[PDB]
Structure formats: C-alpha cells, structure tokens
C-alpha cells in the first residue's frame, strides 16, 4: 500500500536490472506487468509471514518445557496457548494463536464426543444388564432380548428423530455432539447385542468380550465419531473427488455440474475422498504428530471437485470402507442399491482411510440380456439426491485457468506456477536466511540446508540456532511490516542510511533465494523475446526447444532405427548395470504398471523361488545357519526388474512359453504411444553404460579452432544446487521430521545441481551465442557418439546418423539434461566424414553467428540455420506429405508446423 515501499521496490528493480549481465532472472518489464509483480511480491511476503515465520515462532517459543503428553493433547495445547497469551501481537504470532485455537476447538469437540460416547455405552450396558442380584452374563442378556431389543429400537428411533430436528442448528453444539454420540453408542451396542444373540456357543464369549470391551483406552475413535469430526457442518460431510485433468473432452475421469444437477462424467472414479486436512504438513510436523501417508497426496495434483453430502449416505455404504483400523477388506466390496443396482467399492489405498474408489453398476437399461453394467447416470442421480446443490465448488479452478489455462506443455517447468502444478509439488515451502555464519545461508524452520558438490542435506536446529534464526528474521520482518504502514518515518530507512542499504541488500537476496523474481511469477500469455526463464535463459528459445523435443519424441519416424539399436544392444552383459541407476527406477515402475497382468504373472512365478531357496538351505549338509532359508525380497525384485527390462529392450517377440497366450495383449500394449515412448526412454538410459563400457578414447573427426583443437571443454559445470527448487519438489517427509536427512536424488536434481562456470572459455562462447544453458557441453553425447560404429557394428549413413542424433537430442532436451546446442555442437564435431557431411558448414555457421551475437540478439536465427541444413537430409527419402517438420520459431511463442505429419489429420 505505502508509496515508500513501492518506490523502494522500483529502486531495487531498476538497480538489479542495471547490474545485470546476460543470463539473469531479472528483465525489463511492461509498465503493467510491474504492478502484477509488485502485487505478487506483497502477497508472497504475507504468505511467508503467515506460513513459515509463524512455524519458526512455534519453535522459538519453547524455551520452557510446558507440560507435554500424548494423551493430554487438549491440555498441552491449552497451556501452550496460556504460555503465550503474554506474547506481543505480531502476524506470525496471531496466525499461530489462531491455528492453536482452532486445533483446541477440534480436540475439545472430539474429547467431549468420546466422553459422552463412553458414558452412553456404560449407561446402555447397565440398561441391558440384569439387576445387581445377578452378574452380567450372556444368559441374562438373552433373557432380556425380547423386551430390550425393542427398547433399543425405540431409543434409536427417538434419538434419530431428535438429532434430525437438531440438524436445524446452525453450528456444532453441545446438544448436537451429545445426541450424535448417544446415537452412535446406542447403534453400536445394539449391533453387538444382536450379534451376541446370534452368536453360537463358540462365538458367545467373544461377543460378550466385544460388549464388555468399551473403547476406554481411546486408542482409536468410533468410526462414526471420526466421521463426526470430519463434518464441515452439523449433519453434513464434505465429499470430494480428484481429477486426473479437467475433462473437457472426456479423456479423463471427471465430476461436474451440468444443468444444476451434478454429473459424473464416467461410471466410476478411483479418486474420491472425504473431509479435509485440519492443518498443513508444516504444522503437523510442528506438533510432531504422524503425518498422513503421501499415497493420499501423491496420486494427483490438478483441481479437485467437491460438494457437501448428507452424512447418513456416507455412513451407510462408505463407513463400511472408511475405517482407519485394519478391519479385513479385500480388493472390492459390492453394495446393493435399493433400485437393484450394485455399487462397487474399491480398496484403492491399503493404508489411508479417507480416499475411496467407487463404482455404480446394474442391469443395463433397455437391453436384450440382463447384463449388469456400470451406470454413471445412476450415480449422478443418487448423488444429486444425497448432495446439497449449494456450495458445489472446484478447488483452484480459476487458479488453473489463470496460470496453466490448459494442460500446457510436454516438458519441464519454466516458472513456479508450472512447478506448483507439476507432479513434483506437495506444498509451498518458503526458505529464510541464517545470516550469522561468515556468509549467508538458507534454513528451514526445522533445519539449516547443508550443501555439497555431491550431496544436499539439512542439519536440524539446536535451540541456540533457533533463537538466532527467529530473532534475526523477526527483526527483519518487523522492519518490513513497519515500512508497509509507518513508512520511512517509522522504519528510519532514510535514503542515506547504511541501515537502508543493508536492508535492501538483504531483501534482494531474499527475493533471489525464493524464486519470487519476475521470471518466476509473471507467466505471461505470449512470451516477448525479451523475457528470460527462471534460470535466465532466453524464454522463447526454451519454449521452442521444448516444443521441438516434444514433436520429435511423438513422431513415429526414427523408431525402426532405435528399436534395431535396442535389439542389438540388449545382448551386452553391461545392460544389467542400467537397472541399478537411480533415475531408471523412476520409469520402470511405469512399465510395471502398464504390464500389470505380466507383472503379476511374473511375480507369481518369482515367489516360487523362495521354496527352492528354503529347500536348498535344508538340503545343505547339517545346516549351521538358515543359509538362504528366507524369502529374499531383493533377489526376486531384482530378477523381476531385470525380466521387465529385457522385455522392454527386445520386442514382444521375446515372449515365450505360456505367456505367448498373453502376447497379443502385450503387443497391443507396447505399440501405444506411452509404450513406444517408455521403450525408447529406457533405451536411451540404457545407452550410456554400454557406451562407457567400450572405454574408447575421445577422437572428434572435425577440428574446431575457436574452442581448442582436438578437445571439447565438456561438462563445463559449476555445482551450485538450488535449495528452493530442491525443497519445492517432493522429498520424503523424513526431511520434515526435525531430524537430519539426506535429500532424494530426483530426476530434476540433474536439472538443478548445476550453474554455468562463467570463467570457462566454453561458457564465454555459449554466452556469446546466448543459447540456453543446462549442464554444459554434453560429454555424455561425446562418449556415446564416439562409439556408434561399434554399437551399430558398422558405419552409419549420414541419414541414419542424423536420425539417431536427433532422437538422442530430443531425449536430452525432454529430461532437462541439456540444451539443443549442447548436443548438436558435439554432433557437428562428430558427424562422420562423407560426401553429404555438413558439420563443416555448421561449425562455420556457429562462428558466423557468434561474431554477431556478441553485438545483437539472434532471435532464433541459429535454430533455423541448423534446421535448414538437417531437415533435407532427414526427409531425403520421404514424400512431401509425410516429411517431418519441426515447429517454427517466431517472435510470438512457438507456433505449430504447416507441413507433413504435423498437419496430416492433426
């Protein structure tokens, strides 16, 4: 709001632009984007105050050990609040107080409900039991049956009536929770009593146990009381169902409002869930409670569909499922709807309670045979009966349409909006500064980020470090909070103040540490060629290279060459080494999913091997050890993954024996787009260890004078791992434990480990061309292309060569391993000698554009210069209708091609 804060932001913006080299996350903005940027700066600063400094305060204000107990939760929270009612007002403090208050309310409600449940249970057991002239026993309970079953029914009816009246109450209340707990107690005791009456002589003692076993240990709630605690308003639970994507064309499961009625787009969806989390994972770890398993949060990340539904419907069919306690459940349950239809309930998660797979099915309307079939309309109508028509909403829908607009791109993120939409997201974790070291460092509220050339870690904070971090950061945020309101008069950051300069020097590095920079947040509709990506690469060239990689990847053109390569390569013994790579294990899991019937049949074979292991361990003479008298999980898992790898490299023709009966299915699978793309994505990962296994020395065939004769200046990287981009992709919650941890090596880490070494001549060259930079000149591509004559066992045609090398370059761009240029440069250096070779020209063209780029923006001219020379060699055999043509670089963002495959019927 304050004009002074706005002038300060404009000052630091202008100054940081003026200081810029090439490759910077700042760039000059439109005079409209300026305001959206400042608005997002202010918003995200408020988010920081509410959502990271608050949780840091909740670990500074721990200097005295309050009374703490896992059972006395309500009292522990209450005294934690009374510890801090004296603390001065501050937004992080107010947010902490309000969170603790709401959690106090919830725990109070739950404890009340459990108490009145227990008292009602005891009361009903006294009512059903005999007089004190006899002990409570099954015989007297049976003698009581004919009267007190009807008494139980009468009380149940009365309670249901009174509670249905009380549902008119506008908010949760003592009477509401009371009557609810009574109704649940009466229902459960009635059910257990009737089970006892039905119990045989062998069951009777167990049913009497189940009656006398009050849940007074409070080790888990009554299920219906858990549903009560999930109620968003008295008598109603919030249902939700999560999409794969917004299904405007029917490709995805969906559930949407159509003509006032709610409509499921498909006959069942695996992705329903009920309730909502009471607090973020940050607060969950601050309380040091168990965090909800990630299999709830992992499976989808796009906007989610939700409405309030009548709790009676949920508790009728779905309370049978929703129990957190391990009641025996299979893969499925089938529920008779009163209209004669089935509803199928599906155990889509074997640990989490509150997410459900649901399907309705029944006798197909208006058909010659009474086949039962799934029925989306029946489910829609049943929901519309049980739903409230009011307060249907889609979570984040405008956010999606105002940041992604649609499923945007087939490649890595470009700004934080695409990151937060990406599968890697989990929750936005801002970092803050730990400046009392000799040079400034980044810490979470739980731990300071250890960084190393090989490794990234956090050391958890001891108390002195928490006091340092809190007091410093709080003093800074207090200054910022003053500046927004009391202005320069209050903050005393006068224009000549050394304190003002220190403040700005801190703010700029805060706004760098989190990618709140303009390239991080602006996400424009049509990218001006001035703008730069989140790493300071030119935006439009990155977009174009991604669209190129996508188009090359989707084409079916190179596949006859690549699968010949794979068919030969699979014979090398070294290919086994590929499977122990950490990144391959990301994607063979998807092959385990695609080939589920094979993955199951194979595993059902493999589990046999345990029997031979135990047999051999018993056949060994006088075994002094259970030498292998165990189920070795790792052995079978390795052998299974090796089988799946081999079945992915060589074609389905490799199938043999009984599995030939399944071979037509596997053939239909592997020829899908996801099949081909997996097959070649695993092929290219398999290529590197085989290439390395020849250990042939470097020997480029085209010399180049500008960049050192006979060598290449490969790799060319400085290891400078970005902590924010690491933590804002889903590491395990082991990072969040308040305990020291070593972070996962996700595939994006290869995209985030590296920063250009501006001292190297190769960097100077590339900065002259002003290409994007990702991991430097690709020594991997050198090592591969040096041995192609041995991989294929003979010289390639320049057509076959350039085909393979473009598929490789598309693979490198798709996974974010390198730029276009970082591959094609070493290609042109390695292109075989021959009558149609073109690398000599390509080198001279690079030099020609270098001597320009040091003065002028090339605006994609380099890419056209390359494609002009490559395309007529690739398409040399093809008809003009079937040629490949990449998307065409333009001032506006990359537009679709106008020729060949890309138009044919697409």
Residue numbers in the entry: 4 to 909
Text from the published report:
The bacterial Makes caterpillars floppy 1 (Mcf1) toxin promotes apoptosis in insects, leading to loss of body turgor and death. The structure reveals that Mcf1 is divided into an N-terminal head region and a C-terminal tail region. The head contains an N-terminal effector domain (NED), an activator-binding domain (ABD), and a protease effector domain (PED). The tail consists of two putative translocation and three putative receptor-binding domains.
Since the toxin proved to be inherently flexible, we performed a series of signal subtraction and local refinements of subregions of the complex. The resulting composite reconstruction allowed us to build 92% of the Mcf1 atomic model de novo. The structure reveals that Mcf1 is a monomeric, asymmetric protein. Based on its overall shape, reminiscent of a seahorse, it can be divided into two parts - an N-terminal head and a C-terminal tail region. Its location at the interface of the three domains and coordination suggests that this is a negatively charged molecule, which stabilizes the head region. We therefore call it head-stabilizing element (HSE).
